[PDB]
């Protein structure tokens, strides 16, 4: 009902907030993986 809609909207807002957090964390992980790739290149070197 109305109470469930507010809870679902809060979950939707939390999921939307998590989507930005996940994208930001993944972007940082992608940069970190690039640094790890450089270490892998150094191992290849």
């Amino acid at each position: 009902d109305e109470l469930n809609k507010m809870q679902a909207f809060i979950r939707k807002e939390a999921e939307e907030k998590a989507k930005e957090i996940q994208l930001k964390a993944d972007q940082e992980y992608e940069i970190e993986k690039t640094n790890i790739v450089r270490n892998e290149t150094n191992n290849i070197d």
């Binding site: 999921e15 993944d26 690039t34 892998e40």
Partner: protein, 53 residues
């Protein structure tokens, strides 16, 4: 009721938002994989000099 139907639509929005998080994470992982190929190419270029030597 009508309010209950809106809850399902709002709940479905959370799944869509959560799905976008997975897509965003996958895209960054693909970008990281692309950066790995460039690192491998640079290492291959260094190995090319060793092959030339």
């Amino acid at each position: 009721n009508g309010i209950a139907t809106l809850l399902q639509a709002e709940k479905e929005a959370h799944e869509i938002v959560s799905k976008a998080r997975k897509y965003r994470q996958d895209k960054l992982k693909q970008a990281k994989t692309d950066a790995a190929k460039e690192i491998d190419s640079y290492k291959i270029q260094k190995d090319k000099e060793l092959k030339e030597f």
